[PDB]
Amino acid sequence: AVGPVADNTITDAATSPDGFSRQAVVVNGVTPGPLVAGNIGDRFQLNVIDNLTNHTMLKTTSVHWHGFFQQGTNWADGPAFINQCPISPGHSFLYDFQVPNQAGTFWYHSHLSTQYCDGLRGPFVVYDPNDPHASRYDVDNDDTVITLADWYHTAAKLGPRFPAGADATLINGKGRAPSDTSAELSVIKVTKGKRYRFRLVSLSCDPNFTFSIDGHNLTIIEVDSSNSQPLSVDSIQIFAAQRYSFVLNANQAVDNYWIRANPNFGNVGFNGGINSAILRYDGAPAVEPTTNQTTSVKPLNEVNLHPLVSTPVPGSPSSGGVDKAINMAFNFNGSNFFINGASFVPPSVPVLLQILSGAQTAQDLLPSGSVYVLPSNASIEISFPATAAAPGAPHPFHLHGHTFAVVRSAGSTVYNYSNPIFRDVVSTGTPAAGDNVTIRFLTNNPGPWFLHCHIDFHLEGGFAVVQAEDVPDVKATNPVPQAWSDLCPTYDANAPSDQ
Numbered sequence: 001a002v003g004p005v006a007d008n009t010i011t012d013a014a015t016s017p018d019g020f021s022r023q024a025v026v027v028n029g030v031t032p033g034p035l036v037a038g039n040i041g042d043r044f045q046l047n048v049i050d051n052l053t054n055h056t057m058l059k060t061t062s063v064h065w066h067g068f069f070q071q072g073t074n075w076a077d078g079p080a081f082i083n084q085c086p087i088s089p090g091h092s093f094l095y096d097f098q099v100p101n102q103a104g105t106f107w108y109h110s111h112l113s114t115q116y117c118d119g120l121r122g123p124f125v126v127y128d129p130n131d132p133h134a135s136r137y138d139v140d141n142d143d144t145v146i147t148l149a150d151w152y153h154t155a156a157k158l159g160p161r162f163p164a165g166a167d168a169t170l171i172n173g174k175g176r177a178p179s180d181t182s183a184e185l186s187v188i189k190v191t192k193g194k195r196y197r198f199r200l201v202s203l204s205c206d207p208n209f210t211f212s213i214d215g216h217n218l219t220i221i222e223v224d225s226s227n228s229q230p231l232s233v234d235s236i237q238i239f240a241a242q243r244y245s246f247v248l249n250a251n252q253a254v255d256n257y258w259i260r261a262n263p264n265f266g267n268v269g270f271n272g273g274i275n276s277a278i279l280r281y282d283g284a285p286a287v288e289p290t291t292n293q294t295t296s297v298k299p300l301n302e303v304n305l306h307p308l309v310s311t312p313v314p315g316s317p318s319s320g321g322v323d324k325a326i327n328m329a330f331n332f333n334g335s336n337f338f339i340n341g342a343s344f345v346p347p348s349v350p351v352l353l354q355i356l357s358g359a360q361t362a363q364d365l366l367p368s369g370s371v372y373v374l375p376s377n378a379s380i381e382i383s384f385p386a387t388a389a390a391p392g393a394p395h396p397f398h399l400h401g402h403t404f405a406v407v408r409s410a411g412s413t414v415y416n417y418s419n420p421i422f423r424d425v426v427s428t429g430t431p432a433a434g435d436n437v438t439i440r441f442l443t444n445n446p447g448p449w450f451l452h453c454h455i456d457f458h459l460e461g462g463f464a465v466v467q468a469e470d471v472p473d474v475k476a477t478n479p480v481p482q483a484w485s486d487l488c489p490t491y492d493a494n495a496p497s498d499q
């Protein structure tokens with residue numbers, strides 16, 4: 001919709017996506033924010049204009065472009081105090097980056113504190129004119145993007161540290177809460193006889209969602225920006241920050257069908273049309289579906305997903321057969337999460353700025369014990385053993401700057417070194433199953449890259465580490481614009497009540 005070159009204006013505004021009015025952070029007047037789009041090869045120049053006025057939801061901001069490698073533009077990645085200081089209120093900041101080697105479904109969100117939960121999140125699509133899946137569908141446009149979100153009546157800083165589920169699930173920005181069971185539902189329109197590439201984007205800040213459409217099956221063709229072989233499913237459990245493209249054939253009777261996105265906790269089920277939207281065939285009356293849900297008999301399993309094209313797994317086909325193996329031991333003490341004994345606290349000098357200032361070893365980099373220095377041009381294996389020591393499972397972990405092979409998925413004891421799916425957000429499963437979700441990637445991208453749980457409340461409690469990749473080359477590889485250099489002095493000159 002907007003972009004590749006566009007202004008994104010950030011403001012606080014009253015919204016009522018479920019009929020309950022509340023102040024939120026909005027992008028060009030709306031939450032979820034508008035669709036940002038371009039084509040593979042494009043240069044994006046997204047001018048983020050911070051016109052925020054509300055300290056409780058943060059007057060400063062920083063935007064992450066989720067799933068993009070940002071090779072040579074690490075300064076544009078978004079995480080506050082990792083890749084930049086926040087943009088200050090009354091200022092604007094230009095994110096200027098290219099997407100030469102990626103296409104698919106992405107999203108964008110605040111990467112400052114828990115601000116994205118308050119509304120600053122939207123979908124982001126990069127189209128491929130030669131899409132290898134093009135023959136599988138007829139329609140792929142603004143109207144085929146489906147966003148899912150958790151929505152809270154109380155602002156992120158004002159409610160419990162770890163909320164017990166959302167008030168409403170939003171599908172394309174609308175949904176029902178208990179407080180109003182007649183609130184307007186989203187309608188997704190289809191013309192009978194056409195095949196649609198639906199790009200399902202989880203903008204969720206906590207809960208995962210089990211997504212299904214009554215009377216319709218789905219063909220998964222994309223997994224977080226990576227093209228997959230066509231997998232036929234009748235439901236999709238989608239974790240916070242994940243994306244899927246699925247093909248829906250609009251081949252059923254002209255009618256209204258329930259679209260369902262059932263959260264893992266909170267207000268579960270569908271009483272009064274909560275957790276729901278409407279699939280309306282052209283010509284069907286403007287009423288609610290009366291369709292019934294059927295048991296999922298072909299649910300998505302991550303182990304069933306494989307890349308469309310042969311994609312080699314980094315390293316060699318054996319446990320720890322990589323250049324560097326890292327294990328992440330989780331802890332939690334009631335308020336903070338710890339990875340290998342360290343709870344992440346953002347440094348005063350952003351990690352990138354520290355590196356540009358000469359800090360190139362784990363010893364010199366802050367915060368102490370949260371930064372992992374990675375050798376260049378190397379295969380890396382990271383395991384995330386599920387433990388009851390860290391409540392809140394299943395934790396979806398996200399690695400910035402990279403896609404990774406999921407060598408072992410949640411619910412599986414298999415190590416797949418041949419043809420596992422590659423993605424950027426992975427469920428780390430549950431301790432009950434003794435899960436030990438393990439990933440692999442190559443260090444082809446100099447810069448500090450965040451690695452964290454994407455449940456934003458957990459990130460906020462410190463559930464994060466930094467992967468500092470090829471530190472001696474970072475400065476040369478990612479030359480920084482004057483505006484970026486100006487962010488920290490400006491931010492540090494703010495009255496704390498204007499932050």
Ligand SMILES: *[C@@H]1O[C@H](CO)[C@@H](O[C@@H]2O[C@H](CO)[C@@H](O[C@@H]3O[C@H](CO)[C@@H](O)[C@H](O)[C@@H]3O)[C@H](O)[C@H]2NC(C)=O)[C@H](O)[C@H]1NC(C)=O
Nearest residue numbers: 012021022023024054055056057152153154155156158159
């Ligand atoms: C800054 O943004 C915050 C967070 O969105 C706003 O906080 C809001 O603060 C008011 C209290 O002034 C809360 O009002 C309570 O509202 C409920 C629901 O309507 C009502 O039943 C209570 O009697 C009471 O009025 C409100 O819940 C809270 N908002 C959220 C989303 O947590 C604050 O108002 C904003 N500042 C400005 C100047 O707009």
Ligand SMILES: *[C@@H]1O[C@H](CO)[C@@H](O[C@@H]2O[C@H](CO)[C@@H](O)[C@H](O)[C@H]2NC(C)=O)[C@H](O)[C@H]1NC(C)=O
Nearest residue numbers: 214215216217218232233234251252296297298
């Ligand atoms: C979606 O996929 C499911 C699962 O394959 C299909 O369910 C089969 O449906 C036929 C015809 O109604 C029955 O004979 C079988 O018993 C069903 N199999 C199972 C395991 O449930 C369903 O038909 C598909 N729906 C559409 C609209 O294509």
Ligand SMILES: [Cu+2]
Nearest residue numbers: 064066109241
């Ligand atoms: Cu993200």
Ligand SMILES: [Cu+2]
Nearest residue numbers: 065066067400
């Ligand atoms: Cu990301």
Ligand SMILES: [Cu+2]
Nearest residue numbers: 395453455458
């Ligand atoms: Cu988590």
Ligand SMILES: [Cu+2]
Nearest residue numbers: 079398450452
């Ligand atoms: Cu992140």
